[PDB]
Amino acid sequence: GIPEFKQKALVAKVSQREEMVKKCLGELTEVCKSLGKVFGVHYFNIFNTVTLKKLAESLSSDPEVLLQIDGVTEDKLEKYGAEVISVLQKYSEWTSPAEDS
């Protein structure tokens, strides 16, 4: 009934997100490695190249969204999700407008 338009805090469109998704690729790398040394598995064992880019290109920390990722499964989102998403939560705040707390 009462839709919201004109956003809240306008600022850039196709520029800040590009640099945000890239950072996700790096940050996720760390968490991934840390997860391997603990789960007795290799870095690549956590997420594949296609996965790392996915979590970034989207920049959204979601369980269902990250599940549809290439290579990611219910076991990866339930085990690593708690970690990988821990680093993606930040993007969820950067992707959406406004920033209150």
- What is the CATH number for 91? 1.10.150.80
Residue 71 Rama label (left phi>0; alpha psi -120 to 50; beta): left
Tell me how far CA of residue 10 lies from CA of 14, 98, 99, in angstroms.
12, 9, 12
Tokens of 49: 């190249």
- Are 55 and 32 in contact, with CB atoms under 8 Å apart? no
45 is in an annotated binding site: no
Q: Provide the residue range defining the domain that includes 59.
A: 1-101
Q: How was this structure determined?
A: NMR
Q: How many domains does the chain have?
A: 1
CB atoms within 10 A of CB 48: 14
- Helix, strand, coil percentages (3-state) for the chain, rounded to 5, are 60, 0, 40
Residue 66 burial class via C-beta count within 10 angstroms: exposed 0-12, middle 13-18, buried 19 and up? buried
